Coordinates of C-alpha atoms and ligand atoms in Angstrom, one line a residue:
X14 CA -27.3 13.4 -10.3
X15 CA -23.8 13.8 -9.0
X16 CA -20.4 14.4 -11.2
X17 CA -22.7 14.2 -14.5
X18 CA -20.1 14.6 -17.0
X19 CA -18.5 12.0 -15.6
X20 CA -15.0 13.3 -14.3
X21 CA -12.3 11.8 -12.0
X22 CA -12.6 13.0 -8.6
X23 CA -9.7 13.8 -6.5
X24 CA -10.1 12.9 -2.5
X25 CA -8.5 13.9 0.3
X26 CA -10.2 11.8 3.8
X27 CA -8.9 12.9 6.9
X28 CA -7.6 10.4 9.3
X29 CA -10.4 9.8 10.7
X30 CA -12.3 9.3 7.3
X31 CA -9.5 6.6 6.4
X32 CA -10.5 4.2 9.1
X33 CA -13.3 2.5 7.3
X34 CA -12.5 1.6 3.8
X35 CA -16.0 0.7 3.0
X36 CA -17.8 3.8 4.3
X37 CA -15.5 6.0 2.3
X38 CA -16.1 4.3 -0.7
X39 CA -19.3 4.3 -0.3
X40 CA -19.0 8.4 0.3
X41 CA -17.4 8.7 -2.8
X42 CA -19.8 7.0 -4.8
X43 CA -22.8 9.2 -3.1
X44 CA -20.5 12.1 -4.7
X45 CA -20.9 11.0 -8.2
X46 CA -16.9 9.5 -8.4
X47 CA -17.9 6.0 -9.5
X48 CA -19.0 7.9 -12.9
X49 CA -15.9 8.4 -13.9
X50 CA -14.7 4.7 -13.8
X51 CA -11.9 6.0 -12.1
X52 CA -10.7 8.2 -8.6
X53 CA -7.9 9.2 -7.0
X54 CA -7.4 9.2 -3.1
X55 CA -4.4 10.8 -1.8
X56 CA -4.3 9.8 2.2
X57 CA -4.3 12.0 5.2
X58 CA -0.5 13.6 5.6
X59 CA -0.5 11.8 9.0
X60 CA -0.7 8.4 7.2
X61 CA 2.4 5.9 6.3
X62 CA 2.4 2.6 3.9
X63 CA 5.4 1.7 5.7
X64 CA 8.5 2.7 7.5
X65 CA 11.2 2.5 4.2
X66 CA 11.7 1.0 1.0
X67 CA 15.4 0.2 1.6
X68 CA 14.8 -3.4 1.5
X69 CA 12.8 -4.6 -1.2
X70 CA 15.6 -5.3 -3.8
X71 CA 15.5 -8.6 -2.9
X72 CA 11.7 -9.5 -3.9
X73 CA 12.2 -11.8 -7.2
X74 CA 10.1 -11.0 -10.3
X75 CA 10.1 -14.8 -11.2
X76 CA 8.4 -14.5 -15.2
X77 CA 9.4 -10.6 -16.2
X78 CA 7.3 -9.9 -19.2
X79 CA 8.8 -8.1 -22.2
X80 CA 5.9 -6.2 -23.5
X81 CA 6.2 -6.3 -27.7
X82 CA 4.0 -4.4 -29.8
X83 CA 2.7 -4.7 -33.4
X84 CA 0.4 -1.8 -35.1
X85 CA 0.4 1.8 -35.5
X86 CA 1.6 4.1 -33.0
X87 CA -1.9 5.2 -31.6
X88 CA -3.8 1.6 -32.5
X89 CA -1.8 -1.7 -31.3
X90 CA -1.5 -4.9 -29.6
X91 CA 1.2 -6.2 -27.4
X92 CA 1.8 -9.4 -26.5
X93 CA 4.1 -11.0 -23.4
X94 CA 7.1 -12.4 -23.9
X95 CA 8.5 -14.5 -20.7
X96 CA 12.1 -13.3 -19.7
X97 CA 14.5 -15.1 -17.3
X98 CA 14.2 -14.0 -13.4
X99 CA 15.3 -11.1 -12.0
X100 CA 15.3 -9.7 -8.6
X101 CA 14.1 -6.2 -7.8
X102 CA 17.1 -4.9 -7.6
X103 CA 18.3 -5.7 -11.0
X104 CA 15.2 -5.1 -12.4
X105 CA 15.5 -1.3 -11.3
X106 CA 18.8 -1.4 -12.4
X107 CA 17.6 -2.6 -16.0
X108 CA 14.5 0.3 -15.8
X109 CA 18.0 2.9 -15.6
X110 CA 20.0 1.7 -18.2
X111 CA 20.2 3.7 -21.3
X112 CA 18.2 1.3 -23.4
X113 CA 15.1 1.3 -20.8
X114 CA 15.6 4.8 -18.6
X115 CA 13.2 7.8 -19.4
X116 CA 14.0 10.3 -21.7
X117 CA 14.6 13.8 -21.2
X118 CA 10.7 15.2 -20.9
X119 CA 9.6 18.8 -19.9
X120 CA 6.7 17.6 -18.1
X121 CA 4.2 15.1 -17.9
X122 CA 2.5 16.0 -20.8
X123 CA 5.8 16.1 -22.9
X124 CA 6.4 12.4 -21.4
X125 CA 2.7 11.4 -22.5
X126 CA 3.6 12.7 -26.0
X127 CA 6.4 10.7 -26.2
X128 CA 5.1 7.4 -24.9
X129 CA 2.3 7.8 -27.6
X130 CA 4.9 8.7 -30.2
X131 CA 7.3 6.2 -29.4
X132 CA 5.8 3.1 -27.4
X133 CA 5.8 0.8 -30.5
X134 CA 9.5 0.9 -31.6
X135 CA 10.8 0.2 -28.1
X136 CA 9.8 -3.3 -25.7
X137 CA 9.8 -2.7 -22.3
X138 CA 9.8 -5.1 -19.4
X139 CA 6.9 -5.2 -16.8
X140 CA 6.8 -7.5 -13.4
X141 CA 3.4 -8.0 -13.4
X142 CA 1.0 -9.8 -11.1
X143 CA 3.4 -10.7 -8.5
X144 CA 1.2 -11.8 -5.2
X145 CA 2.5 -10.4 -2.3
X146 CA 2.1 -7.3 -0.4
X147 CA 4.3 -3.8 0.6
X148 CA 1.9 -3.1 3.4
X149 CA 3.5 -3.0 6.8
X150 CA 1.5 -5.4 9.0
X151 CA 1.1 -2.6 11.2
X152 CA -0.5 -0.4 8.9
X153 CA -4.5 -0.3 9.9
X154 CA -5.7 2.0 7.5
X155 CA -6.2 1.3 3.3
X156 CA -4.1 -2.0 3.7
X157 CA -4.6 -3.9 0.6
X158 CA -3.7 -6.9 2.2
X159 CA -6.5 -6.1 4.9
X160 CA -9.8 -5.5 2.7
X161 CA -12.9 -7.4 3.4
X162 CA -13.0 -10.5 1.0
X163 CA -14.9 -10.6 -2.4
X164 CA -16.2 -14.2 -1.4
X165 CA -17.1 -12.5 2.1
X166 CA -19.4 -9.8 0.5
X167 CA -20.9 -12.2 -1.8
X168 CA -21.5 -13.9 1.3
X169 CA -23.2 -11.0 3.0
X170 CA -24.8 -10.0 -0.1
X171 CA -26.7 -13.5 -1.2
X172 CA -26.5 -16.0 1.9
X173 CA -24.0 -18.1 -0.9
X174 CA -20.9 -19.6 1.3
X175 CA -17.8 -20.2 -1.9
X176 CA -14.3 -21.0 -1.8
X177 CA -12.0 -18.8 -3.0
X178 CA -9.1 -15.9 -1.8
X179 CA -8.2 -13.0 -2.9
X180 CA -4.6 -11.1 -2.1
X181 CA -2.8 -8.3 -3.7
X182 CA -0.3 -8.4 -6.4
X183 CA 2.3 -5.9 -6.7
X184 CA 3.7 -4.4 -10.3
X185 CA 7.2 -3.3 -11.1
X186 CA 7.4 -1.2 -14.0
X187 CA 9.5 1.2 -15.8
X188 CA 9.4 3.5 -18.5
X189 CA 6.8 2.3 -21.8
X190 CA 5.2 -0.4 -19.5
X191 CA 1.7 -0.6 -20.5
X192 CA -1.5 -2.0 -19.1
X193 CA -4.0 -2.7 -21.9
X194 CA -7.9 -1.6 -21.6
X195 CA -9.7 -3.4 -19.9
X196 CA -12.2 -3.6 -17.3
X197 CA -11.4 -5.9 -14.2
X198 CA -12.1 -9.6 -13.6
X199 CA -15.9 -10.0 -13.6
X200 CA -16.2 -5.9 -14.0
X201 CA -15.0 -6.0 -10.2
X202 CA -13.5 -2.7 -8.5
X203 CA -9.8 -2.6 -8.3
X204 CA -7.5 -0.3 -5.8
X205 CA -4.2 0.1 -7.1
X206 CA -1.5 1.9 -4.6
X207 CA 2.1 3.1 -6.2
X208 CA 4.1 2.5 -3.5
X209 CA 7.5 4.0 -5.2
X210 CA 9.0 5.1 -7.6
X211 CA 7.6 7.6 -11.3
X212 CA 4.0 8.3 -11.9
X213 CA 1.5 6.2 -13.6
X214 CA -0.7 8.1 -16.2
X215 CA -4.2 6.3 -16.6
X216 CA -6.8 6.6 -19.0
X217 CA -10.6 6.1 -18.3
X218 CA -14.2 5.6 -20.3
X219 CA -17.5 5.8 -17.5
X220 CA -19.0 2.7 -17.0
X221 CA -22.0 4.1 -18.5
X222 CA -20.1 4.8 -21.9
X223 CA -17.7 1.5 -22.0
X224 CA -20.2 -0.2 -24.9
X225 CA -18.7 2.9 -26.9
X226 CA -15.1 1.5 -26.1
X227 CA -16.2 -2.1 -27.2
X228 CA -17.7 -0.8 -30.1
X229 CA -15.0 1.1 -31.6
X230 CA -12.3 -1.8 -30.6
X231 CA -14.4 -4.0 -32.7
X232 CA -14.0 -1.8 -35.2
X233 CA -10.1 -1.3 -35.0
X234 CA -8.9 -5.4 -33.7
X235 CA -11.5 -6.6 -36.1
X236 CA -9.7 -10.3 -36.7
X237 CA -9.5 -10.3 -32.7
X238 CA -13.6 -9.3 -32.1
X239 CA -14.1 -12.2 -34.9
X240 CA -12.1 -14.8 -32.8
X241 CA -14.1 -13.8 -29.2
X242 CA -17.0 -11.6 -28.2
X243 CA -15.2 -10.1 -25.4
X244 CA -11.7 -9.8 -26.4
X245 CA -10.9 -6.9 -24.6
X246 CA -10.6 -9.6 -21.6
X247 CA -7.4 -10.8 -23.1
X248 CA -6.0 -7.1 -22.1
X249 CA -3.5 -6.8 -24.9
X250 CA -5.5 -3.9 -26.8
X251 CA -4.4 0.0 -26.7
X252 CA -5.7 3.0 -28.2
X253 CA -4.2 6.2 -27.8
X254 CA -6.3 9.5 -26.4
X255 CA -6.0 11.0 -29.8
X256 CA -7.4 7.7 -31.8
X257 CA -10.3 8.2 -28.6
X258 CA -11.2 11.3 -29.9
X259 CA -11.4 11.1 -33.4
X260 CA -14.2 8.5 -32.6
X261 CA -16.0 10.8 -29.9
X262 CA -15.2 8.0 -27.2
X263 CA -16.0 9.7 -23.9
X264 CA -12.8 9.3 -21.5
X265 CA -10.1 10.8 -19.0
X266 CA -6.8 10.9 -18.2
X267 CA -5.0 11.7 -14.8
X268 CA -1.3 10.5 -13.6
X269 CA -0.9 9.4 -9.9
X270 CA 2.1 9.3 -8.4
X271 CA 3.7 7.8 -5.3
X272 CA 1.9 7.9 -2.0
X273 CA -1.2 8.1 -3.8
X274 CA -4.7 5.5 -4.5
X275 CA -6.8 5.2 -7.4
X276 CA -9.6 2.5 -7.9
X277 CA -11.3 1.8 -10.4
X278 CA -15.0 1.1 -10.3
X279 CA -17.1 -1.7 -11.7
X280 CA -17.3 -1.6 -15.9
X281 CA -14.6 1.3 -15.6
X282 CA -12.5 0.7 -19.0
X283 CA -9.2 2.2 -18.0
X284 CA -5.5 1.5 -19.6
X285 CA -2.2 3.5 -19.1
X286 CA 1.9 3.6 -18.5
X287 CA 4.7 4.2 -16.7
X288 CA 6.4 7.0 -16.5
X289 CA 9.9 5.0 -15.2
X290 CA 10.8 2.8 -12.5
X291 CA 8.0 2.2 -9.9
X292 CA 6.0 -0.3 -7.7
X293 CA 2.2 -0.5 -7.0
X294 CA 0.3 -2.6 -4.9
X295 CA -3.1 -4.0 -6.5
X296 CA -6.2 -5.5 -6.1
X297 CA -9.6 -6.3 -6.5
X298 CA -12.9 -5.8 -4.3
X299 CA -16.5 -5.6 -4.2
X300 CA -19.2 -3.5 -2.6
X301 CA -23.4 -4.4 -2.6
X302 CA -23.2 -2.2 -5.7
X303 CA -21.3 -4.4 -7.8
X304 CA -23.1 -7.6 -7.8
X305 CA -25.4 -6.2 -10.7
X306 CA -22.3 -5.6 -12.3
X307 CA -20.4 -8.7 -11.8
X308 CA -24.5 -10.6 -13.4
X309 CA -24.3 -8.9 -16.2
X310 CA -20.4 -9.0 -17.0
X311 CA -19.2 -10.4 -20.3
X312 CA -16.9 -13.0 -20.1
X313 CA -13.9 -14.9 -23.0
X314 CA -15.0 -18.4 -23.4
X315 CA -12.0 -18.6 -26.2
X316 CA -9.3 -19.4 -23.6
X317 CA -7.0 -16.4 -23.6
X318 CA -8.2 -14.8 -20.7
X319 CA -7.0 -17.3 -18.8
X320 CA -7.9 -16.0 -15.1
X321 CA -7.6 -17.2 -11.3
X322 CA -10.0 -20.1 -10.1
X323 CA -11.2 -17.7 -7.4
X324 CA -13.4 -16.5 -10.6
X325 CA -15.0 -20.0 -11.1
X326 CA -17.9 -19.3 -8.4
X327 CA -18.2 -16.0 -9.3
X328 CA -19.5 -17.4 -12.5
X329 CA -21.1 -20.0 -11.0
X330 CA -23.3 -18.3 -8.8
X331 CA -23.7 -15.4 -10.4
X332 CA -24.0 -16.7 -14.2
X333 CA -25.4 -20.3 -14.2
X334 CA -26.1 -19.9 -17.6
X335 CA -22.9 -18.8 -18.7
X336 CA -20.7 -20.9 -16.6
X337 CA -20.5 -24.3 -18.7
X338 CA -19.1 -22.3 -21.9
X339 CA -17.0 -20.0 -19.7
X340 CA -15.1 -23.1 -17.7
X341 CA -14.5 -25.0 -21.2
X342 CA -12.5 -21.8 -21.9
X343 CA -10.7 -22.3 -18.5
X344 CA -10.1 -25.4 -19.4
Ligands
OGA412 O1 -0.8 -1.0 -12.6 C1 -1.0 -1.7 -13.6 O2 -0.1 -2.1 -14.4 C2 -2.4 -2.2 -13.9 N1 -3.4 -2.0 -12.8 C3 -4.7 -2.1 -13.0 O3 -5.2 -2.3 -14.1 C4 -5.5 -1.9 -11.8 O4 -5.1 -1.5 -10.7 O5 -6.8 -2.1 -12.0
NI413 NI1 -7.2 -2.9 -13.9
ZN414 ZN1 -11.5 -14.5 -25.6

């Protein structure tokens, strides 16, 4: 078996590997990457997202989130609070004041000691799930606004014809932004490109270890496990590398920074933070391999994972039996 303890594997496809998005996935997987819940791709040299930056300071971030913590340092929550609008401009501008910028650091490990250290006491603001794309139209190679459809390889997959889209969403963050664990909607793969901007440090369990993860959050959010069987779906839950490894939770960490892709593969718990002002590109997919996954995925019913309605045939087709209790939660 390939990459048997599990690591993240680093790529680097030609240009003529990065034509086809599917076959290369596919030829990562046959290399053991998908064990890791995690990769990175960095793309040929020859290769271009787009022609400049200069002009995005005008995109609006219409519902900024201010990103509010309660715990301990290396076990907490964080909930949203909704800010006023903001453009991207001012929103960078915000990420570089004195109250929000990045602190002096060595390194990136120095930075990751401080963010684990420090997160709780400080509220950051995060732009988060904004659709829309950075992708020049022109761009032919690992476009995220270009992927094959999830409803068009459930299509291929199972002869089952459902409504539904799926587009990108692009992610302004600066320094302290967090993303929760979590796995994606439906335990779907996700590609995430930072377009711009300071790294992104992730964290990741193997799919065939996240039941470990589940375990031990159960163990450390026990009023949240009481209130829903899959809570981690609510993606407000962090638990620092440290509290990971007093438990003997397998995982790994690895930063990514601008010009570079990392997806995550189906039941691939991952969380992680900014390092200071940046913008990704994201979204989700799915391959022939995932439709085991997205069967057997466990879903919130409670109603605080509220999620797009491109999800409701997902569960309809691919969990009749579950889809009654999971739409009463919807609605
Ligand atoms: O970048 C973020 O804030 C969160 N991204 C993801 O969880 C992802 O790409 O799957
Ligand atoms: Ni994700
Ligand atoms: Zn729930």
């Amino acid at each position: 078996a390939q990459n048997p303890n599990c690591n993240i594997m680093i790529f680097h496809p030609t240009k003529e590997e990065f034509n086809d998005f599917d076959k290369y996935i596919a030829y990562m997987e046959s290399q053991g990457a998908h064990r890791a819940g995690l990769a990175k791709i960095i793309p040929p040299k020859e290769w271009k997202a787009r022609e400049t930056y200069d002009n995005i300071s005008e995109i609006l971030i219409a519902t900024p989130l201010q990103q509010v913590a309660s715990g301990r340092a290396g076990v907490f929550t964080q909930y949203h609070k909704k800010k006023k609008a903001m453009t991207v401009g001012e929103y960078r501008h915000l990420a570089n004041s004195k109250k929000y910028q990045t602190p002096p650091h060595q390194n990136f490990e120095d930075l990751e000691r401080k963010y684990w250290k420090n997160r709780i006491y400080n509220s950051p603001i995060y732009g988060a799930d904004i659709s829309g794309s950075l992708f020049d139209e022109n761009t032919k190679q690992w476009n995220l606004g270009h992927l094959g459809t999830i409803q068009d390889l459930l299509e291929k997959e199972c002869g089952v014809v459902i409504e539904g889209v799926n587009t990108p969403y692009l992610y302004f963050g600066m320094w302290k932004t967090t993303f929760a664990w979590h796995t994606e909607d439906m335990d779907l793969y996700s590609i995430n490109y930072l377009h711009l901007g300071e790294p992104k440090t992730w964290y990741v369990v193997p799919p065939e270890h996240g039941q470990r993860l589940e375990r031990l959050a159960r163990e450390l959010f026990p009023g949240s496990s009481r209130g829903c069987g899959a809570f981690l779906r609510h993606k407000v839950a962090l638990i620092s590398p440290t509290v990971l490894k007093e438990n003997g939770i397998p995982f790994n960490r690895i930063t990514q920074e601008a010009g570079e892709f990392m997806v995550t593969f189906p039941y691939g718990y991952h969380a992680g933070f900014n390092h200071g002002f940046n913008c990704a590109e994201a979204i989700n997919f799915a391959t022939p391999r995932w439709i085991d996954y997205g069967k057997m995925a466990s879903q919130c019913s409670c109603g605080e994972a509220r999620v797009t309605f491109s999800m409701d045939a997902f569960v309809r087709i691919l969990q009749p039996e579950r889809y009654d209790l999971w739409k009463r939660g919807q609605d």
